Design a protein around this ligand. Structure first.
Ligand SMILES: Nc1nc2c(ncn2[C@@H]2O[C@@H]3CO[P@@](=O)(S)O[C@H]4C[C@H](Oc5ccncn5)C[C@@H]4CO[P@@](=O)(S)O[C@@H]2[C@@H]3O)c(=O)[nH]1
Lengths: 179, 179
C-alpha cells in the first residue's frame, strides 16, 4: 500500500508545487505592491501547506477556524496543461487572529491529496482501510518532505504544517509563521 | 508498484471527474445556446479523455496534431476546494479536421496523471523505471474504467480514449465521436 502515498506525493510535487513554487515570490511581491491594502501588513513569503494526519480537509478553511479568515486571492497563474488552454492555479491569502486582532497574513491551504486519501478510505472499491489511511497520510508527508529537501523550485518557498488533534489551528500556523 | 496507478486513478476520479462530470452537460448546453457561433455545429456531449499508454502528454494539444485545433473554452466551473476560494476547473473545446474540413467539435483533454507517471519515471528519487511506467499506465486506465463503470456521476458523461503508437490522433477521436 506504501505506493499509494508515494504516488500522490510525487503527483503533488510534479503537478503543482514544482509549477507554482518558482513563481510564488513574484506573485506575493506583485500582491504586496499593487493589490494589498496600503494600511495592512505585507503578505508573508512562502506557501503554508496544512497536513492534517486524520485527513480531515474542509473546503472552507475560513469557517473551520474562527481565527482563520479569508482576505484575498493572489494574482492567478495560468498555463496550457495537458490540452487545457490556460488552466488556472489560484491561491488564497488568510489573516490569522490572536485575541480578536490580526497577528499574521499568509498564503495558506490544505494538501488536496489528503482529501483523496480520506475519500479512498470511504469507497468500498478502493480497498483502503481507515488504518491504511493514517499510515498513508504519514508516508505522504515524509515523501513530500524528502522530495522538497532536494527540490530546486523550493527556495525557502513553502512550509509543511503536519498536525494531529483544545487544538488551535491558527496558533499552529502562527508558530511556523513567526519562525 | 500496483498501488501507484491505483492511487492516481482514484485521485483523478475523487479530485476531478466526480466533481466536473455531473455539471458538464449543463456547461456544454450553456455553451451551445449562449456562446457557440450561430453557424457552427453543436459541441458534442461527453468529456473525451486521451490516454496515451506511452504517457507522452504535450501541454499544447492544438500543435501536437495539425488536425486538432483549439476552438474555445467552456464556461468555468469554480468552487472552494481544500482552502482555495473559487478554485477554477476549465475545459477546452477542439475542432477535429478531416481532409482540411471540420468533422467534429468536442471537449477534449489528456488525463494529466499520465504526465505524472512520465515525470516519475525520469526522477531518480521516485524509484520508478520506464518498464514500471507502461504497466502503471495500463493499470491507471483499467482502474479508471472499473471506477467509472460503477460511478453515478458518469451518466454517459465521458469517453476514455486509450492508444499506443502512421497513427492519426484526430481519426482515433473521430471514431469514438461517431459512435
Ligand atoms: N491545491 C491544489 N492542488 C492541485 C492543483 N492542481 C493539482 N493539484 C494537485 O496536485 C497533484 C497533481 O495534479 P494533476 O493535475 S497530475 O492531477 C489532477 C488532475 C485532475 O484535476 C484537474 C483540475 C483542473 N483541471 C484539470 N484537472 C485531478 C487530479 C488530482 O487533482 P487534486 O486537485 S485532488 O490534486 C492534485 C494532485 O494531487 C491546484 O490547482 N491546487
Amino acid at each position: 500500500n506504501f505506493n499509494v502515498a508515494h504516488g500522490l506525493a510525487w503527483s503533488y510535487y510534479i503537478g503543482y508545487l514544482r509549477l507554482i513554487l518558482p513563481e510564488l515570490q513574484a506573485r506575493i511581491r506583485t500582491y504586496n505592491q499593487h493589490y494589498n491594502n496600503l494600511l495592512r501588513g505585507a503578505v508573508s513569503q512562502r506557501l503554508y501547506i496544512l497536513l492534517p494526519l486524520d485527513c480531515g480537509v474542509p473546503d472552507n478553511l475560513s469557517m473551520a477556524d474562527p481565527n482563520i479568515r479569508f482576505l484575498d486571492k493572489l494574482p492567478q497563474q495560468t498555463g496550457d496543461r495537458a490540452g487545457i488552454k490556460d488552466r488556472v492555479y489560484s491561491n488564497s491569502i488568510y489573516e490569522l487572529l490572536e485575541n480578536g486582532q490580526r497577528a499574521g497574513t499568509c498564503v495558506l491551504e490544505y494538501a488536496t491529496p489528503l482529501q483523496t486519501l480520506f475519500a479512498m478510505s470511504q469507497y468500498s472499491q478502493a480497498g483502503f482501510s481507515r488504518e491504511d489511511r493514517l499510515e498513508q497520510a504519514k508516508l505522504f508527508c515524509r515523501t513530500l518532505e524528502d522530495i522538497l529537501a532536494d527540490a530546486p523550485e523550493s527556495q525557502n518557498n513553502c512550509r509543511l504544517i503536519a498536525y494531529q488533534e483544545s487544538f488551535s489551528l491558527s496558533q499552529e500556523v502562527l508558530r511556523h509563521l513567526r519562525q
